[PDB]
A paper describes a structure:
One of the key proteins in long-term synaptic plasticity and memory is the activity-regulated cytoskeleton-associated protein (Arc). Drosophila has two isoforms of Arc, dArc1 and dArc2, with low sequence similarity to mammalian Arc, but lacking a large N-terminal domain. Both dArc isoforms are related to the Ty3/gypsy retrotransposon capsid, consisting of N- and C-terminal lobes. As opposed to the corresponding mammalian Arc lobe domains, which are monomeric, the dArc lobes were all oligomeric in solution, indicating a strong propensity for homophilic interactions.
Each monomer consists of five helices in an orthogonal bundle fold, and the structures are highly similar to each other. The dimer interface is in both cases formed by α1 and α3 from each monomer, and the total buried surface area at the interface is ~1400 Å2. Both interfaces contain four hydrogen bonds and four salt bridges. The interface is conserved, displaying only three conservative replacements between the isoforms (A125/L170/F172 in dArc1 to S112/F157/Y159 in dArc2). (D) A comparison of the dArc-CL crystal structures with the same domains in dArc capsids. Both the dArc1 and dArc2 C-lobes closely resemble their counterparts in the capsids, with an all-atom RMSD of 1.75 Å2 and 1.13 Å2, respectively. The dimer interface in dArc-CL, which corresponds to that in retroviral CA-CTD, contains mainly hydrophobic interactions; half of these hydrophobic residues are polar in the rat Arc-CL, and the first helix of the dArc-CL, a major part of the dimer interface, is tilted away in mArc, possibly explaining the monomeric state of mArc-CL in solution. CD spectra of the dArc C-lobes are similar but differ in intensity, suggesting that dArc1-CL is less folded in solution, despite the very similar crystal structures. Kratky plots also indicate that dArc1-CL is more flexible than dArc2-CL.
Author numbering:
A (entry chain A), B (entry chain A): 4 to 86
The structure:
């Protein structure tokens, strides 16, 4: 696979744009995370890597400390896209 | 301290510019890494996070697989700034 350093750069290269649902943004980013060495990062760390790339439309409502899992983040983000 | 997600964003926000010696670029980035939870990342992972942010003037000569430690990276980079 791709070297890890190149995955990290690609992960951080693109922030979530206004047109991009949280589900599809998260799928794309988690696909990059899955190419890193198995067992390197726990879910908390993966969420820490991803959180700041989320669009402000989510972060205004959901802070990092409010979610512990990707499932939580997606649940809340979907409501936000409907609220 | 700062939340981890904010550290990661700050770490990836600025690539190494032409005017910036490798020593001072690395010190700045490692100061961010030191604010993450102790024991989260090993040196290999830290190098993987940092490598792609190095200026192409180093990466043309030094590939990721050639270095195993920050000490190696700095040793080689200093020679490159003199070669």
């Amino acid at each position: 696979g791709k070297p890890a350093y190149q995955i990290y750069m690609e992960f951080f290269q693109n922030k979530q744009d206004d047109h991009d649902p949280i589900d599809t943004f998260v799928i794309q980013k988690r696909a990059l995370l899955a190419q890193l060495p198995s067992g390197r990062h726990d879910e908390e760390t993966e969420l820490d890597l991803l959180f700041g790339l989320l669009n402000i439309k989510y972060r205004k409502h959901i802070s990092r400390h409010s979610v512990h899992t990707f499932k939580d983040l997606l649940e809340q983000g979907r409501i936000i896209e409907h609220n």
